[PDB]
Amino acid sequence: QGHMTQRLFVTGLSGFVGKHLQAYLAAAHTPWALLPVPHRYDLLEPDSLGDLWPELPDAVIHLAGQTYVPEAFRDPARTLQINLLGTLNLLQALKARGFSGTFLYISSGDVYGQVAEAALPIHEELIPHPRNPYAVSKLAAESLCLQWGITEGWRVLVARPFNHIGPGQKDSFVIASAARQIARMKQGLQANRLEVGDIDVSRDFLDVQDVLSAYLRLLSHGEAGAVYNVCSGQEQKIRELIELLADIAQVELEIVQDRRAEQRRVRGSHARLHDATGWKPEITIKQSLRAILSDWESRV
Amino acid sequence: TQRLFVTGLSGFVGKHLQAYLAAAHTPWALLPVPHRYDLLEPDSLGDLWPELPDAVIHLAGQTYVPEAFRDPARTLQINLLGTLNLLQALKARGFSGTFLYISSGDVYGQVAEAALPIHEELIPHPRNPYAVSKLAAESLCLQWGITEGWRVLVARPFNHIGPGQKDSFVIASAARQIARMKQGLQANRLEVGDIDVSRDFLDVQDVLSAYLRLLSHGEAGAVYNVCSGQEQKIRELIELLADIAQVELEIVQDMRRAEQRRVRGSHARLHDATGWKPEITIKQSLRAILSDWESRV
Ligand SMILES: NC(=O)C1=CN([C@@H]2O[C@H](COP(=O)(O)OP(=O)(O)OC[C@H]3O[C@@H](n4cnc5c(N)ncnc54)[C@H](OP(=O)(O)O)[C@@H]3O)[C@@H](O)[C@H]2O)C=CC1
Ligand SMILES: NC(=O)C1=CN([C@@H]2O[C@H](COP(=O)(O)OP(=O)(O)OC[C@H]3O[C@@H](n4cnc5c(N)ncnc54)[C@H](OP(=O)(O)O)[C@@H]3O)[C@@H](O)[C@H]2O)C=CC1
């Protein structure tokens, strides 16, 4: 009956993506059985990691870390400690326990930095040029994890996801903030006015569920030692997404000016991930935007 | 004349750089180091610069690969967080000049022979925690160039040769033992690992010259290999040392085969930016290390 089951441990289960992954694994038919977390742990504290795996994971997805760019600029050392030294502490704890399975490190499409429009769509052979300490720490942790795969013989995979859309996303993202505010307009809690910065840029978006499905297909099919973009391959203009949110919400609003963005356009290539795994995006942008508006209605 | 601050002056490369700068009339005046400091201790860094540097060469760190394997965390602390502490100390002092970070050709990792010579557009694949820490510090320094607007340069030097090199390095060890054989202090027998590999070697003086040229003419935000572009078989260099010493040597195996058999780097980018070329032949370098080892014994 069903799948040959494998034990999966996920760090960061309490964060934005983690909560969606736990729900995904509870509802879907998958070979991955999510291991329980025996107690709270801190990646900065090796003694808190010791007994996390009464049953040994066959695979690990490492989501946990300091994920806010302004916080990384505020305290770069702490972001490096959490994202790089924390990853090292996790790797060493897994090693001491006897782990030798699949380790999928979750990086970010932000490692690429400034990319010329002529180099679009971004592919994994483009040399990255991180522009903030968070992106620096992600690229450094990528290298570390892949070095561990070389040194220890583990199956190490790296994913570079681009823009995510989902309930629970950081309010500092313009699309998440726009949805929150529009849901407040629906309920008469704020005027039909949106104060924006530069929204005449395009970015590559995926629903969080398509991002999750890419990670699980990487666990099933990815090549040891390889880096994969996780992206839609489609540019969306921020302004058109805001207009579609208003349309879905049955609201009319004015967008009012609250410095131009450095990177005007971002399109990623997911050819490598699709060729290796069969993965394809399945959630439409309209469904993604409706989902975040609906989530906000029950919270505002 | 511009003020230059160098970390790691007490190390192998830094001692040669201090000597070089005292000898030649370069555009750089080496700043004094007012007190002993520790890159892991931000409070030791604040008063390091009574006069503000115009340029910095960052040599200091944990340079030994077996030590990095022994304690990866410590090597990442020294090489990455130590670099951050230096960047933050300079920023707080008001520095906004040129920062040259010294990385390593070891960041590249495994490279197919058909892909030689190694150029800077090859994606690096570090294979040990030292190389990881160097690649990570490169990205940190270049990110600081972007965000702070400083002129940040990275050099990826390949194998170095010279007096005062770490004794665990194969050529340095061979030269020391052959110098002892010449004096009769050891039997004419040499225990070696896999010496059937080739590496790209430069005399430390040529490496230093490349760094000084980069300070003056490197392009902000760019990475430069610092290498000879010629492969040297370890077995041949050992034979050359014995020939210079006039020692009849016997090489004995100890026993695993090296992962990378051949390494050759391209200095094309460095040369086109700075006109630099190696000036010291491999034989002249080996004479010098042998002759230094002779006085030592
Ligand atoms: N969200 C996005 O838009 C994108 C995300 N990513 C990457 O995806 C991954 C998931 O992001 P997201 O879900 O939004 O992240 P969140 O910030 O929402 O969640 C971070 C998680 O890490 C945990 N964590 C933080 N510090 C530590 C620590 N020192 N020890 C142990 N656990 C710790 C947090 O637990 P607690 O709250 O208890 O501290 C939390 O569960 C990250 O690697 C991120 O960089 C990259 C591209 C896009
Ligand atoms: N030597 C070689 O063959 C190669 C070297 N390189 C790179 O070139 C640079 C110079 O190498 P090399 O001269 O051989 O290095 P050494 O190991 O000989 O010298 C290291 C220097 O760093 C200083 N240092 C170490 N830790 C700290 C710390 N926590 N705070 C302050 N200073 C510290 C040491 O001072 P102290 O003695 O007091 O600890 C010393 O001056 C390094 O970045 C190295 O990676 C590149 C490739 C090959």
Side-chain angles (χ1 to χ4, degrees), chain A residues 198 201 203 261 263-264:
Chain A
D198 198 354
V201 304
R203 294 289 186 268
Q263 182 82 27
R264 313 303 302 172

Side-chain angles (χ1 to χ4, degrees), chain A residues 196-217:
Chain A
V196 305
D198 198 354
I199 65 171
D200 294 307
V201 304
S202 77
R203 294 289 186 268
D204 187 323
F205 294 93
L206 288 170
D207 195 273
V208 60
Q209 179 178 304
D210 281 330
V211 176
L212 293 178
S213 164
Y215 297 168
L216 295 178
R217 297 198 79 88

Side-chain angles (χ1 to χ4, degrees), chain B residues 8 10-13 38-39 59-61 63 102-103 130 134 157 160 165:
Chain B
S10 67
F12 160 57
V13 175
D38 182 348
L39 289 168
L59 296 170
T63 64
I102 301 315
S103 187
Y130 159 82
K134 295 300 245 178
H160 288 44
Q165 169 70 294

Side-chain angles (χ1 to χ4, degrees), chain A residues 73 76-77 80-81 84-85 88 92 124-127 129-133 136 139-140 143-144 146-147 150-151, chain B residues 69 72-73 76-77 80-81 84 88 120-123 125-129 132 135-136 139-140 142-143 146-147:
Chain A
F73 273 118
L80 292 170
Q81 298 290 351
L84 180 63
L85 278 300
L88 172 68
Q92 296 190 306
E124 292 85 344
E125 290 304 313
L126 183 68
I127 289 176
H129 297 285
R131 301 175 71 80
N132 66 65
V136 168
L139 191 59
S143 307
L144 174 66
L146 292 165
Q147 180 257 119
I150 292 166
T151 297
Chain B
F69 271 120
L76 290 168
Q77 296 294 343
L80 183 62
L81 276 303
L84 176 65
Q88 292 275 41
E120 293 90 344
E121 287 138 52
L122 287 192
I123 285 172
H125 299 103
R127 306 180 62 80
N128 62 67
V132 165
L135 188 59
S139 315
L140 179 68
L142 293 170
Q143 176 256 124
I146 291 163
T147 63

Side-chain angles (χ1 to χ4, degrees), chain A residues 2-39 41-256 261 263-300:
Chain A
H3 289 102
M4 288 178 302
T5 300
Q6 303 215 239
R7 287 172 173 66
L8 169 62
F9 185 89
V10 180
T11 71
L13 274 170
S14 74
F16 160 53
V17 174
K19 291 174 65 175
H20 279 289
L21 181 48
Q22 181 169 352
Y24 190 119
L25 289 173
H29 281 103
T30 182
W32 311 107
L34 185 59
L35 291 170
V37 186
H39 53 79
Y41 61 91
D42 193 330
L43 287 168
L44 296 173
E45 264 286 326
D47 299 337
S48 80
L49 310 175
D51 298 274
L52 283 171
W53 310 289
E55 309 192 333
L56 185 76
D58 297 297
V60 176
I61 301 180
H62 176 37
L63 298 164
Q66 201 304 94
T67 70
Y68 194 47
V69 174
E71 173 59 21
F73 273 118
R74 191 195 63 81
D75 193 350
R78 184 146 198 95
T79 283
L80 292 170
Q81 298 290 351
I82 296 178
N83 289 354
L84 180 63
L85 278 300
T87 294
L88 172 68
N89 291 336
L90 173 66
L91 291 167
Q92 296 190 306
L94 284 163
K95 183 176 173 183
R97 168 71 177 79
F99 182 76
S100 63
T102 293
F103 191 98
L104 167 61
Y105 176 69
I106 298 318
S107 184
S108 168
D110 196 41
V111 299
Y112 288 107
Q114 202 151 80
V115 173
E117 298 193 356
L120 299 187
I122 297 176
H123 57 99
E124 292 85 344
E125 290 304 313
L126 183 68
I127 289 176
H129 297 285
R131 301 175 71 80
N132 66 65
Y134 161 84
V136 168
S137 78
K138 301 299 262 176
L139 191 59
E142 285 188 18
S143 307
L144 174 66
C145 291
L146 292 165
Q147 180 257 119
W148 268 64
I150 292 166
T151 297
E152 301 297 328
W154 303 354
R155 178 161 173 263
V156 176
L157 313 160
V158 168
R160 293 171 173 172
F162 286 56
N163 290 72
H164 286 47
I165 300 180
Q169 177 64 296
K170 296 165 190 257
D171 180 72
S172 72
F173 279 112
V174 65
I175 294 310
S177 170
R180 184 190 53 86
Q181 287 186 76
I182 288 171
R184 290 170 51 84
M185 303 173 188
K186 286 181 67 68
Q187 313 219 29
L189 293 177
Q190 95 179 54
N192 290 32
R193 267 166 56 85
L194 217 46
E195 287 181 8
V196 305
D198 198 354
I199 65 171
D200 294 307
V201 304
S202 77
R203 294 289 186 268
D204 187 323
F205 294 93
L206 288 170
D207 195 273
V208 60
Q209 179 178 304
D210 281 330
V211 176
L212 293 178
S213 164
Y215 297 168
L216 295 178
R217 297 198 79 88
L218 280 172
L219 296 183
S220 292
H221 307 299
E223 298 213 355
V227 175
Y228 300 87
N229 291 340
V230 177
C231 53
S232 76
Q234 301 220 293
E235 287 173 60
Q236 326 260 4
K237 296 175 217 139
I238 302 321
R239 173 185 302 280
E240 288 179 14
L241 296 181
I242 289 167
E243 284 170 291
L244 184 55
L245 277 169
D247 193 19
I248 293 160
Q250 300 176 86
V251 158
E252 245 180 29
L253 53 79
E254 48 183 323
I255 304 181
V256 295
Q263 182 82 27
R264 313 303 302 172
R265 304 172 52 188
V266 177
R267 205 167 73 252
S269 161
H270 61 229
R272 185 181 280 197
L273 163 71
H274 169 75
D275 292 341
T277 74
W279 178 92
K280 183 178 179 180
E282 294 274 86
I283 303 295
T284 64
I285 181 48
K286 199 167 93 166
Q287 176 166 0
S288 293
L289 294 176
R290 191 171 45 242
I292 62 173
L293 281 167
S294 306
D295 182 67
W296 271 121
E297 155 172 293
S298 45
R299 290 164 58 194
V300 312

Side-chain angles (χ1 to χ4, degrees), chain B residues 31-46:
Chain B
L31 293 165
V33 174
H35 55 77
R36 157 66 53 78
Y37 60 96
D38 182 348
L39 289 168
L40 299 166
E41 292 172 18
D43 292 338
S44 69
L45 312 185

